[PDB]
Structure formats: C-alpha cells, structure tokens
Amino acid sequence: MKTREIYAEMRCIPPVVLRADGRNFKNTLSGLGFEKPYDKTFARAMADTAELFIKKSGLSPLFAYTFSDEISFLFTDLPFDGRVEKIDSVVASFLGSALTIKLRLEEPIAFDSRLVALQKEEIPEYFHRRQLEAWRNFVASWGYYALRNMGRNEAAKYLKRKKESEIHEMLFERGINLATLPSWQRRGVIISKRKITQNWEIPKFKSEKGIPFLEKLIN
Amino acid sequence: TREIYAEMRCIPPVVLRADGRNFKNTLSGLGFEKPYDKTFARAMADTAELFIKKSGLSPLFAYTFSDEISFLFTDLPFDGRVEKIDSVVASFLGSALTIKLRLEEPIAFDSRLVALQKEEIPEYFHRRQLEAWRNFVASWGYYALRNEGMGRNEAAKYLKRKKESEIHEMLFERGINLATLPSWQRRGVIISKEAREIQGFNPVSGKEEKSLRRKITQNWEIPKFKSEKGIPFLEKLIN
Amino acid sequence: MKTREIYAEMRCIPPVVLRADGRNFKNTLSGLGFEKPYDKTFARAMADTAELFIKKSGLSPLFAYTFSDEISFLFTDLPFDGRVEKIDSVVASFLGSALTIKLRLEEPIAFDSRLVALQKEEIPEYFHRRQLEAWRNFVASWGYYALRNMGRNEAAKYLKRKKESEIHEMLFERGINLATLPSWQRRGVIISKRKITQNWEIPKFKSEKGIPFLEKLIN
Amino acid sequence: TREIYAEMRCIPPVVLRADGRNFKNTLSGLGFEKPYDKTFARAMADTAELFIKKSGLSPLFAYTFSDEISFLFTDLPFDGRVEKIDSVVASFLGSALTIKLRLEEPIAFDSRLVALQKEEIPEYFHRRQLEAWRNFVASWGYYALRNEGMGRNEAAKYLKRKKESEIHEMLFERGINLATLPSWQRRGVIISKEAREIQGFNPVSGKEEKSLRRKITQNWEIPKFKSEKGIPFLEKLIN
RNA sequence: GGGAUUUAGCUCAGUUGGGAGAGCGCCAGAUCUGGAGGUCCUGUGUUCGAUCCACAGAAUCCCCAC
RNA sequence: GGGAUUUAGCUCAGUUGGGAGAGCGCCAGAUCUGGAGGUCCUGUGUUCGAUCCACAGAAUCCCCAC
Numbered sequence A, C: 001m002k003t004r005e006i007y008a009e010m011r012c013i014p015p016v017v018l019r020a021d022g023r024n025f026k027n028t029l030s031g032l033g034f035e036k037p038y039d040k041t042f043a044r045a046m047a048d049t050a051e052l053f054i055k056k057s058g059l060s061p062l063f064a065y066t067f068s069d070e071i072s073f074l075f076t077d078l079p080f081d082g083r084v085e086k087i088d089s090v091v092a093s094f095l096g097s098a099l100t101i102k103l104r105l106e107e108p109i110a111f112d113s114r115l116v117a118l119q120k121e122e123i124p125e126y127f128h129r130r131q132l133e134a135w136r137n138f139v140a141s142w143g144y145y146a147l148r149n150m151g152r153n154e155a156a157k158y159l160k161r162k163k164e165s166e167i168h169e170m171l172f173e174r175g176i177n178l179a180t181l182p183s184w185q186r187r188g189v190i191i192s193k194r195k196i197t198q199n200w201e202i203p204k205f206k207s208e209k210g211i212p213f214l215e216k217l218i219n
Numbered sequence B, D: 001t002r003e004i005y006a007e008m009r010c011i012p013p014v015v016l017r018a019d020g021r022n023f024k025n026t027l028s029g030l031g032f033e034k035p036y037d038k039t040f041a042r043a044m045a046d047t048a049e050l051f052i053k054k055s056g057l058s059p060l061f062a063y064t065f066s067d068e069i070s071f072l073f074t075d076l077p078f079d080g081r082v083e084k085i086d087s088v089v090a091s092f093l094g095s096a097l098t099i100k101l102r103l104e105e106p107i108a109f110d111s112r113l114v115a116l117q118k119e120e121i122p123e124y125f126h127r128r129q130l131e132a133w134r135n136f137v138a139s140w141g142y143y144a145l146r147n148e149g150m151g152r153n154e155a156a157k158y159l160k161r162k163k164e165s166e167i168h169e170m171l172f173e174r175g176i177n178l179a180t181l182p183s184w185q186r187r188g189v190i191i192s193k194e195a196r197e198i199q200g201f202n203p204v205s206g207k208e209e210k211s212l213r214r215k216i217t218q219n220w221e222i223p224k225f226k227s228e229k230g231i232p233f234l235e236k237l238i239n
Numbered sequence E, F: 001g002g003g004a005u006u007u008a009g010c011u012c013a014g015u016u017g018g019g020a021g022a023g024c025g026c027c028a029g030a031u032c033u034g035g036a037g038g039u040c041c042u043g044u045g046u047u048c049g050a051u052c053c054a055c056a057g058a059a060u061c062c063c064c065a066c
Ligand SMILES: Nc1nc2c(ncn2[C@@H]2O[C@H](COP(=O)(O)OP(=O)(O)NP(=O)(O)O)[C@@H](O)[C@H]2O)c(=O)[nH]1
Pocket: B019, B020, B021, B022, B023, B024, B025, B027, B028, B032, B033, B034, B035, B036, B037, B038, B040, B041, B066, B067, B135, B139
C-alpha cells in the first residue's frame, strides 16, 4: 500500500513559504465572545500560535507573518526533506492544536496549508502582496461592519462599486476613523527571532524603512 | 501564483492516514502509561468519532490504533485537492485530540492520501492490521527490554533481528503474556456507522413506514480482517 | 540532487491509460511524400510502432488503440512501479524511436505522453470517447481537404457553423464518398494479443458487437 | 478529465536529465566496443547537439556521459508542464539517437526534471561529474573482472565493497591504467554555445558595427568542475 | 485538429527591420496648456540591427464535437 | 473576504417536504395532434419521507483589490 501513497514522496525546493489559512473560521469561531470585525484576543492568539510554532515545532522557520486568519512561514531549511504532504499536514496540525490551546476551545478547528514555491528574490514581493491583502480586508470588513450595524445582501449592495477612499469617507461619516486604528489591523504582525519577539507595529514592507526591515528578517 | 501543488487532485475511493508526530516521547513525558494507556486510545477513538461527526467530511469509517487513524472516503471536499484535504484533516485531528486530552502543549498529526481501487480497499486495512500487530509485539518487547537495563538502540536492533516467536518467549519469561492482553491493543478500534431499523408515521399514507438510522459506534473487539467472520465484517463496513 | 528530483517518485494506480500524441507532426512529417488528409503508409507505421511497443518494450500493455497521430495503451500492470515521469518519458521515447525506424526518418520526431488515471469501469467509455475523436477529425479533415483543393483562412471560413451532415453532403457533391472510405480512417486500428494481431476493421466501441469486443480486449 | 498529472508544473531554473534504458546490454548486443565505444559517445554528443539545434527548446547547455545527458533550462515550453517536457524531450532524444546510430530496433530514454536554485546550478553538475568518474571506474573494473571469469553479481559486489584505490590497483595489474585513458571517459562531454565576435555594416549609420554569433561547440576535454579553472568555466556556461 | 487575437493601468490605432502613438483613466498644477507611464505575450534563431522575419511555445476567443 | 446563480440537449419557469413543468431543439410520423428525454450541482445529516430544511463543499458570475 506504500505504492498507493502516490503523493508521499512529492517534494519542493528551498526557499518555500507555507501559508496556513483558518478553515471556515467565520462559522467555527462564532458563538464565542469575539468582537467584530477585529478581536484583539484572537489576533493575540494567532501571534502566540505562530510563536508557539517557532519555539516548539523544531522545524525552524526564519519568521512568521500573521494577520487573521492566516500565517505565512518562511523556510530555507525544508522540514521532512521537502515532502509536500508531510509539511502541509504536520504544520497545519500543529497550528490547529496550538490555536485550540491558546483559545481553550471546546470544539475543534482546522487550518488549511499550502506551499508557495518562491525563488529567493521573490520573497519580499510575496509578503508585500500578503500585506496588501491585509489592507483590503481591513478596509472592506470595517465598511461591512459599519453597515450591518442592514441585512447581508443589503449591506453588501451598498458597498458595491465603491472604492477604498469613499469607504474611508463613509466610515468616518459613520464615526469610524480608520487612519487612527491599531497598526496590527492595517498591517499585521511579525513574529521572529535568540529570543522570540512579536512585532505589532511593523512597517509597510515595500517602503523605507520597510524594505531593509524585511531584508534583515530574511538575512 | 507559485502555489504549484494547489491543483493536485486525487480520485476516490481513497484512504486518508494520519499519524501522530513524536507521540511516543510526548505521551511518555506527559505521564501516560507505558507502553499502552487506555485513556489515550479512548482519546484516539473519540477523536476519530468527532471527525466523523463534525468535520464536514464523510468518511465511511475509521480504523485507529497506536497513534494512527485511517479514514475511508468515496467522496471528498475541495474537489479532492491533496494539500487542502491533508492539511485540513490533520489540523482538525490535532485540534480534536488536543481537546480530548486537554493538552497544554501542542501536538501534531502527519497526514497522507492513499489512492485505492474498489477491489483493493479490504487489502489496505488488512496490511494496516498487520502493522497494528507488528507494533503490539514491538511496543511491549521494547518495554520489557528497557525495564531490565538494555539501551534504546540495542533494544531496537534486538527487536529487529529477533523473530516474533523469540520475542513472545522473552516477553513470556518476564511475566508478559501477549495472548491475554486486550484485543484493542492487538487489532485496534473500528469507528463506524451502525444501521438500525426504525419506523414512523406517514400522515399522507396514513400508515406506519419503516426506515433506517445510523449511529456512530466504537468497536473495541474487532475480528481479524482476513478471518472467516472478518471478511464480511469489513465488506459491510465498505459496502 | 536527488532531493531536487521533486517529481521522480510521484505515482499512479492501476488501471492507467497512456495516451501518446505526436508532437507538432503537421510540420515534422511534411516534406515527405505523405498523402492528405490520410496516408496508408503512415497509419501502417503507427500500428507497427504500437505493435513494436507491445512486442519489444517489456512493459506489457493489454492492448493499443491507435489513430494518427495518437496511440492509447491500457495498463493494469504498471511499469516502473507506477512512476509518472519514468512511464511517460520511457514510453514516449520508445515510440519516437520505433516510429523513426518504421519511417526511416532523416530528422528527429517526438511524441508527447500523458497518464489518464481511469477506474476500471471507465475504461470502455474512454476508448469510446477516443473513437468519437477519430470520427470528428475524420469528417472535418476530409472537408478541410475537399476545400483547399482555397487559402487557410478561406477554406476555414467556409466550414464554419457547418455540422457533420452538411459536411457529408458537401463532400459528396465535391466527389468524396465518406461512407465508403476505409474503416481505419473512420474508426482507427486495434493492436493486441500469443501472437500480436493488428485489427484494421474494428467495430464501433459503444454498440453490438462492439461492446463485447472491447470487453474481451480488456478481459 | 482524469489526466490528473497534466497540470503539474515546474519553475525554472531546471535541469532535465535523460538516461538510456537498458543501454549497457543493448549496446553490448549490437557489437559496440566494451566498456567504451567512441562511436557511441559521438552519437550521444551529436544527439545532444541536435536537441540544442532543432528541438524547439532552448537548453543553455548539455552535459553528457555514459548513457545520460543533462540539459540546463531557464525557460521552458508548455508552461513548464512535467509530463509534456519529459515525454517530448525523451522522445526527441530517442528518435535522434536512433537516427545517429541507424538503429534497426528501438531504444528509449528515461527522463526527469531536477528543480534547482540559481546558486545551486554549479553543484548539480559537480555531482553529475562525480558520477561520471564513479561510472568510469566501475565500467572498466567490471570489464576487467568479467574478462578473467568472475560472474556478474560477484563482480558487482566486488566493485561495491572494494574501495577506489583497490580497484585502481586491480585494474593496473591487469594492464589497464585509468590515468592515461581519454578525458571524455572520465569527465564526459560539454555541448554549449560558444560566442564569437563578428562585425557587419550598418547602412543607416554608414559605419561598421560589432556583434556576437554563437556556435554550438562540443568540448571533449572539459576541466574538473570544482578545480581552479573549472569554476569560471562552468560559471560562464551558466552565465 | 482548424481559424484568429495578444502593443501604456483601460479601449484601441500603427509596418513587415533604425526600436512606438491616440482617446479614456492617472499624478503636477467641469476646459485648456505640464507630466509620468512599454517586455510591442515568452524563449531561441536570422540580421550590423527585430514589436515586424523564421522556429518552438504561452494565454484568451470562435468553429467542429459531445 | 462579501454578494449571488446552479432544475430536460438549449433558454428559463416552479415551493420552503408526498419527490417536477413551459418554450426552442430532438426522434416517430413550413402547422397541428405522438413521443422521448431529470442527479432538481455533490456528499452527509434532520425527517416516516428531501429538488426545498441543517452542515461541509463544488462549478460559474459580480463587488472589493492590484
Ligand atoms: N505510552 C504510550 N505510547 C503509545 C500509546 N499508543 C501508541 N504509543 C506509541 O506510539 C508510537 C507510534 O510509533 P510511530 O508513530 O512510528 O513513532 P512516533 O513516536 O509517533 N514518531 P514519528 O511518528 O514522528 O516518527 C509507538 O512506538 C507506541 O509505543 C499509548 O497509549 N501509550
């Protein structure tokens, strides 16, 4: 039946980025006392989960970059000899366990994981793009929370065709000041190393002094 | 993007196998009984059941032993994508086990996909069952050696070179009878959907109609898969 | 560098169908004295190539079904322990070599190969569909040869929106009787086994007595 | 469809390695010289050159020895699809070799993709070069043993257990000096694009302009890749 | 298989070789003068020189088909 | 992330539970009477019973974005 394990020896090459994304977290975390659209306790649990992975997994990622509900790990030293299945599964499992511990959950959750096969000159770009994501879902989800506070379809159809700037305007004219909101909501959090430090006020990756920041983070 | 493994798909029927990472030593360090702890096996079976119950996936049944679980699938989510299924299932299992055991430090399952033909599905489990037995003899053997002062590597080598009969002998001389030990240690546990006949009232027909209800059952005294009564057992599990 | 061979141990499960398709054969076979749109010598070389594979490769396919420029082999006994790269490459290479021999080529040709991971109840269907292909390219390519005997774009734009039946009609009204054309052009050729036989007058797979034909071919 | 491997892609830089299937025995049976035939090596180099010249693919360079060829790629057709590249290249190489050798019975190349980092590309070839040497000592050794009546398996075992120095000794006592044998047997052949300076007339400028032209060259006396003059050689090949 | 299309962020022009333009949108000062912005889809050839020519491909569209 | 759509070969209707319809196209005899054709996108639940209800997904479309 080892011959039937047809993906077990499929591999990747360094460097690789593993992105783990919470699976169906909108319905699995509801029921708890989480604030919307951002909960400090939850983001804290995510950063602590990434830190837990860096400290206890033994797989040695260079660093983690998280913004709920996702975490990206950078690897130059591939775990399990670069085997895709084993890396994805084991890492996702570790994160599920760790997050479950930090939140003291009564019912199980699950992460998904995937390998992004970057070339080392593309590593900054990746994170930049990821940070870009962190911005959109920061704006939009606040707007969607400003509205609906409206039904699903209604609050949705107000936001259609509207660009980020008029979302800013609408949000302020509803009493929400995005520009002053915490940096971890807008940009995310970086966990790295030696002692393990969580950085909750990181710069924009594609800028000064954001470029050398990421560059030192990569070595 | 560069997610070059994201479109990798498998075609059911398929068995997913999850195996605890560095479990022997972690369980050893947390104070569990050696080499077998029934609380742990209970946690494994319950984790399998919780997966069958609340994962959103539909495994036909689970077969668990030691630190591993095998799920049978004839239908998969995420269009059968390998990364998705492996990561999500392994994660759910890690989380669930962490809950069942009230762990304070994180554990992890490895997970893999085993692509099978229909006519191949019994064979698989048979092989797995052998492994259970293979583990059952090893785990105890090792234990009995380590008790009397033999080092780890020497004990492992010993078990590797010694044949099963000799290990039975050595085990028996030291007060351990492998034939009297519980069945779940030697064969593992089957978690499945046992069907039962019910009946209710059809108001349109104005009559009583019979129907089926399935209950998630844990079988801790399973037969040998390749035995006489083992074959139709497994065949009914596969259906 | 074995760790960098990231596809070398990727596998398939039985049964599998390998389809090999001539790569860029329209431009690689032109220059020789091949008739259009069908050359008996070439189809003969293809069938002989498949037979050569069945006889000399040692990989034991159950049977081959060919219609230029493609060959499908059925395998229940996977070569090279089901390794995808090795099967595709080795088989395609063997076919390239064999075809090059049978045609006595001065310049190299190449096949592509791919694995179709069928389940054994889907094996008839596959070939049926393949035979369906053999029909379209039989009709169309004759039409395209009836025309242009017109420029590329012109002869093309005559055929647009026209269905198979009016292509039949047009072809006859140009002096081409499709219904009477050789069975190997319409349906293809089956090579199997014991002595190795080429069947140049096979039935339609999805019919009687086409169903039991294929069924005995599969055992 | 069920073509579940068809979308499998690789990301350049990448090296493709092709290796003749059952070549030792086929070459043996066709009457080629043992354990080295220069006509054969010529056919291999010429096949590599013909691949560089007319395959439609753009390998930076080829490195061939024994029955294997490695091509360096920084750009691939079919969007890097594995099945496509492996099958098409292996097929082209089989056909080309069949032509160069005027074979009457078919041969076949196996082919595989080796995914590499830029900074990794030298290392690869170095390892391959080692293998060349490893083959060079084996092929001869085997030969000399088989000459004097030692069976196949016994000879293989002999070569496996005996260290390289001992094999050198045994070889030398029987009249074979591995140091005087040709360089292409020990290091292989490099087929590449050697650049040369040309110059022509710009009619618009009304002046003479210099330019570059690349010629496919076969190097049969290559340096040791990890030697002093070997490093910039390989580095210029990779560029 | 067969026919096409691919050039600025968007919609398009432009020829068969000396390396590129309009309108919308964009920044700097609802209309004018100021701007930025390009891999002419990729690689390799040919050529003194390629957006244009030759070869092998890529992406998207249409026909045949089911 | 957010909003949708998915039912005959094609274009669509139909409700919140007793298991399904029109028009085009199709076969049998340019218009009428004769027909065939269904996995109500998948799996699992709930229910005596699911196209409809609950959960996890799939495919396609739109918004945000770059
Ligand atoms: N103490 C204890 N050990 C158990 C129990 N059930 C299984 N084990 C141990 O779990 C181990 C499983 O072996 P295996 O998975 O191959 O190794 P592992 O220790 O998990 N490490 P890894 O799988 O990462 O290589 C066996 O050695 C067995 O002794 C239990 O109830 N108690």
